[PDB]
Amino acid sequence: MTLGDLWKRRLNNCTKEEFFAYRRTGILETERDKARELLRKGETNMGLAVSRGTAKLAWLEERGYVNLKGEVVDLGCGRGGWSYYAASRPAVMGVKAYTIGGKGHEAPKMVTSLGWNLIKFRAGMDVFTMQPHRADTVMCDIGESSPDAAIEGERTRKVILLMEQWKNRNPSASCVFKVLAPYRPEVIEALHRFQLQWGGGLVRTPFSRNSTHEMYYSTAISGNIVNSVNVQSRKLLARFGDQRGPIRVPEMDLGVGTR
Ligand SMILES: C[S@@+](CC[C@H](N)C(=O)[O-])C[C@H]1O[C@@H](n2cnc3c(N)ncnc32)[C@H](O)[C@@H]1O
């Protein structure tokens, strides 16, 4: 058993109020009041982020931890926060975005955020059975939370396998992907094998809630995986009991228009 496994057990033992206070304490949170109502009313001429994912990917890019360029694939795009972010980057030439949709899952939000015309959305697509194709940058933000850490480990393992399949097709592609449960043993093993062949490492974004252990793997960084994970587990465990709130920051606005 790992520190991350203990984190999960402590998290599941929180009351609803303890959980609400814990998940937000000390995290950066974009202010989505305006964005939420625009989307609800169906305004399509907006460049405000369609989801909380845009600022996470922007932080990775702005830190230099990811390289977004060329033909981009967004595997599991949901509302499209990463696809709209990528499409606004001048180095990006096109985005092919795929998501399953269906009951209980987010369909792409349709807006004129800068570069929207360079995105091809396909909803109703399962990426785990879809043949890879050529790409310069592969992105995947898949990983559904569950109270069962073993289920989260298996979901994470499937994402890493998908990445391996896209790297087999595109050995030179940049990769950035969510690792939902990085402390599980089959995840550590798969990440070690991925790093052995492709390089890369893990990083925690400051927008991730304390109620998720998610870390982002990118081929553009480095670092010992086990140490990266354990440092993060210890940080999450120490935050139980903290009552400070989140740090509110403005939401990203990419502007509107075609590229
Ligand atoms: C909520 S998103 C990540 C958020 C996104 N990066 C953003 O910025 O808006 C992950 C998405 O992957 C989708 N998904 C999960 N499994 C999938 C699969 N096997 N094939 C395609 N999409 C999947 C989920 O429905 C979910 O919408």
Side-chain angles (χ1 to χ4, degrees), residues 1-16 18-30 32 35-66 68-70 72-130 132-188 190-242 245-247 249-259:
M1 197 180 166
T2 69
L3 284 168
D5 290 300
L6 184 48
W7 163 85
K8 190 68 178 198
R9 280 176 165 75
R10 281 232 178 249
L11 183 68
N12 287 338
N13 283 337
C14 283
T15 66
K16 309 270 208 133
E18 292 176 335
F19 184 88
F20 177 89
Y22 174 71
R23 70 200 284 262
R24 72 180 181 177
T25 187
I27 78 171
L28 299 181
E29 202 152 56
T30 56
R32 294 194 51 76
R36 182 188 302 110
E37 189 68 32
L38 286 169
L39 293 163
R40 194 195 190 277
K41 82 190 302 288
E43 178 60 65
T44 64
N45 194 225
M46 54 177 294
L48 278 166
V50 303
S51 75
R52 294 191 186 276
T54 300
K56 290 192 177 164
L57 185 58
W59 182 87
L60 294 167
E61 167 90 0
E62 292 170 4
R63 282 280 187 116
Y65 298 159
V66 303
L68 301 178
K69 61 158 100 143
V72 176
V73 169
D74 189 8
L75 302 168
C77 68
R79 291 192 167 181
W82 283 22
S83 284
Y84 286 116
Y85 183 72
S88 76
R89 299 304 92 188
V92 168
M93 296 303 105
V95 181
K96 287 178 181 164
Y98 302 91
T99 206
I100 188 64
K103 185 68 164 168
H105 299 306
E106 292 275 5
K109 288 299 195 196
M110 302 273 88
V111 294
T112 61
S113 183
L114 179 62
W116 62 269
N117 59 299
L118 304 180
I119 310 165
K120 289 169 177 320
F121 286 108
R122 298 273 65 211
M125 172 67 71
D126 163 45
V127 298
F128 292 128
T129 57
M130 189 184 75
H133 57 72
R134 200 201 83 71
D136 302 297
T137 303
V138 180
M139 318 198 288
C140 179
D141 199 22
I142 291 175
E144 185 188 336
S145 283
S146 167
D148 187 330
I151 288 173
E152 297 190 307
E154 170 69 8
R155 288 174 177 170
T156 302
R157 187 197 63 81
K158 282 175 71 196
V159 168
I160 300 163
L161 183 53
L162 174 66
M163 295 296 97
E164 289 284 7
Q165 290 161 350
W166 278 81
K167 276 296 233 170
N168 183 73
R169 170 67 186 86
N170 303 286
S172 67
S174 185
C175 284
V176 52
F177 54 98
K178 180 185 188 170
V179 181
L180 169 70
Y183 53 89
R184 294 293 297 174
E186 76 274 30
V187 172
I188 295 277
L191 284 180
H192 276 152
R193 285 193 290 101
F194 193 97
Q195 191 185 53
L196 183 65
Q197 190 165 17
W198 309 119
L202 291 168
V203 66
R204 176 76 172 188
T205 89
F207 298 90
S208 298
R209 285 170 180 135
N210 301 302
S211 51
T212 175
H213 210 306
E214 70 183 15
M215 299 175 80
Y216 286 88
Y217 194 96
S218 165
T219 46
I221 64 181
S222 58
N224 183 282
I225 286 156
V226 165
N227 293 342
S228 276
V229 175
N230 282 329
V231 163
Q232 184 59 43
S233 296
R234 275 180 214 106
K235 168 163 188 146
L236 293 173
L237 279 161
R239 279 190 167 167
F240 282 110
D242 284 5
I247 294 125
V249 296
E251 186 53 275
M252 311 261 315
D253 193 328
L254 305 181
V256 298
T258 57
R259 287 186 53 214

